[model samples]
Target: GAMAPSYRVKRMDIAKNDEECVVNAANPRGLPGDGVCKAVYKKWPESFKNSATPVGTAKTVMCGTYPVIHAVGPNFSNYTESEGDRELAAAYREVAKEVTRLGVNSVAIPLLSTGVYSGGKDRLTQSLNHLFTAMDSTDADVVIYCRDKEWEKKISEAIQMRT
Candidate 1:
């Protein structure tokens, strides 16, 4: 089968929010219920309220009022090659699956393993390319928000070239 069109890549100063749900590629320390999450919660508490209850592991935390799904993984710049690839891919896959299962219509992600895991641009791009391809085939809308312009441009170029 052919690959789907690559998702649009954009650079934003702050996190993007929508009614469907918000996907955050955050670290363990930046928990879903803290900081910016609190602000989002205040703005939209209804979305955050989920009476359906969580079915999975305790690691998943529902932040404030927005139905925001937080995917916390390791900092890419901090990992070794062998270890980082395995962990990073696992995290991405888990988040993708969970978002689908929860009926979230949209998801936003950052470069999971590129910044802190030090996995290099190629590996990081490859991992995301794999993840996004899988997600594109699903019903969800995927958005990748970058912190810097350079990384955003690089990722945009890579996705266009590959997908």
Candidate 2:
């Protein structure tokens, strides 16, 4: 079978992603904070964060031209690797399902929990693993955007391996 042709990795400002929607690694209450959330919030201040999007959950909210999928990723430091992995995977799965539910042709997602919430060294690999696996069941074009130059090559290489 073919790999996930729907997925791609890009190095750029995620808020500038040219897609139907963008995914935000939001807080549990769906509030805007640093990293992806801060950028998206700055651009679409009013519509970016509103409802309660608890950890391990994801939901969509309109932000003018782009619909935002607010996903609250697990703060790995708070849980064991196994538990955190489940929460992280669930967050990705919710976003993937939301993409299909929204019927959008394309969406851009950031590496969740790599900001102040990050706790483990395995986050990059684990994020890619769960993201690729979750994206497998979706037809929507997915662009994985990374702003940090440090991680651009790492994520790109990982995506290559999966595809």
Candidate 3:
């Protein structure tokens, strides 16, 4: 891998990605039911936040050939927790490093907690920048997919800012 990671940016359906690896976001307590965790629930019936997963960090969840990176992101809808926290960026960075270390040549990540967690103009403006920075480092092809048009555009803009 190169010193400063290099990757691609794409706007697509993260839930249906075919990359060698994918990333998912969960609450600190392993709460599942929405966000990236929903897609994860398909193969792993159990919630992603149990003792198996990492809290305030990143962990790997086996999904057969295509592994999943489960990262416990900031608490959702917590008034004390803002959407612009550095943890969001940190989580993505950790996941990127893991995928790269695991020799994954391609990966797809989602907008961690922005979907059902909570929505706001401030969150939209501040969230994706950190995500792009963390994700842009991998030597593999990276795609941070999103379904929301608002977030999709914000992510694209964030990628441009990184380039």
Candidate 4:
């Protein structure tokens, strides 16, 4: 038996394009009609926040829309433990689970911990790898949109050998 590949990575300019539905990245407030959410919705009207599941941690109310689902581990910013790696892995897993649960055929994501979190390239790579691995088995097209060329190159290289 063979295991599924999980996720496929790609580079994109999220600020100017709507590459997919489920965009991965830190969308503060998760505001439904603002920022990236608004941009995505405007481009793809079919995209909408999942009323059934809102964005938040165990006790925080991260407001907004577009079905933004926060990861299930330690916060990506200002962490004090090496566990950040583990937490990121968990976060990507959560993303994968949500994508499957929602039955979304295409998804957009950013560099999980590369922005304000100041996550190094190694850490970001690990998290993305985990995410892609989880998504490889699914019948979905995963697009990794980044604000920088470095991110785009990294994602492209990561999945170039695959499909």
Candidate 5:
């Protein structure tokens, strides 16, 4: 395994974290659906709806304070299990690239696609894996912001597996 940037997993909302950049789990159309997306949207309503970011990729939206990287992950509702994993991995890769491109000193990101997109332990573990692996080469300090108790619990369990 490679080294990711200095990172921490914290129980908090991504949009509330004070970082130079934040990663919002986005749909292909970059709409404000729920969770982190909704929070970010409330802050910057004018930044979305003009772009259709394809699954497994990302785009940058400038917020007044900093920046929000909308990373589009696969909706498991229509995707097979393997497709979900692969797309999530690709999404994170794009996220890391965007972070580098934007030259942000820090970032806050949540576990993407595990919400209404749906999945269990395997999905959590896979998400963490792709997240860290993709972020290996980035220079920014990173926060893996866990928004709720279940996300915190599963991520804790997944870290236990890593240990």
Candidate 6:
């Protein structure tokens, strides 16, 4: 088995966390949509100015306690059925590295690419495998916060199975 942080899957709203930051799925243009950033913008409209980082990279933004890191997960220009682990790997790596560098202990992330990227359920689960595998390289407290309670519950069950 791969060594990982043993992260816990949560069903809470991204805007309601005590974590140092939450990972927001943003487009290449860095705009917030249906993802956590949607709530973020509604809360702190000035926190995120633009796509802080270029496509395929990540940028940290301030939103008080729950600061955010905008990472372009997948989009119209970047979606591909045959895509490898590059998308999740790069974003997770960047986020893990950033959080570690900033001395942040915890971060919450949504199941990126599911809606905006046209990623189906199975593909999303597979992508989570890849994202966590990529995250195993770090020691940050990561939580895959799902928008759906059922998904959150099921993924929590999945994490419990890891033990």
Candidate 1: residue pairs that collide? 48-65, 75-117, 76-116, 76-117, 76-118, 77-116, 77-117, 77-118, 78-116, 78-117
User: Residue 140 in candidate 5 has what lDDT?
Assistant: 89
Local distance difference test, per candidate? 0.54, 0.80, 0.64, 0.51, 0.79, 0.67
- Deviation in Å, model 1, residue 108 alpha carbon: 1.6
lDDT of 5 by residue, 1-163 (tens): 1135466678976667877888888878777788778887887776675646899998887766577788988888878988877898999999998899888788888877877776443367677888989886787887788757787877776665655
Candidate 3 differs from the real structure by a C-alpha RMSD in angstroms, to one decimal, of 3.5
Each prediction's total of clashing residue pairs, residues at least 3 apart in sequence or on different chains, is 10, 0, 2, 13, 0, 0
At residue 95, candidate 5 shows an lDDT of: 95
**Which segments of model 2 are wrong by more than 4 Å?**
1-5, 120-122
Give the range where candidate 3 is weakest over 10 consecutive residues by summed lDDT. 46-55
Candidate 3: tens digits of C-alpha lDDT, residues 1-163? 4344444445555667767777776655555567567666765544353524544478776655567777766654653464337566677777767887789777777766566654442465555666666765557777777767666776677667757
What is candidate 6's lDDT per residue for 8-117, written digit by digit as tens?
87677777765666777776565666657688677666667764675557787775655677877655345565443466557766776767766766777776666656
- Model 6: which ten-residue window has the lowest total lDDT? 76-85
For all predicted structures, in order, the TM-scores are 0.64, 0.89, 0.75, 0.61, 0.86, 0.81
Q: Compare candidates 2 and 5 on lDDT and give the better one.
A: 2
Best by TM-score: 2
Candidate 6's error at 65, in angstroms? 6.8
**Residue-level error in angstroms, candidate 5, position 111:** 0.8
Model 4 error, position 1 (Å): 20
| Tens digits of per-residue lDDT for model 1, 119-147 | 44555565666466556556666667666
**Model 4 off-target regions past 4 Å?**
1-20, 27-67, 70-77, 119-122
Tell me the spans in candidate 3 whose CA falls farther than 4 Å from its real position.
Answer: 1-12, 29-31, 43-54, 79-84, 119-122
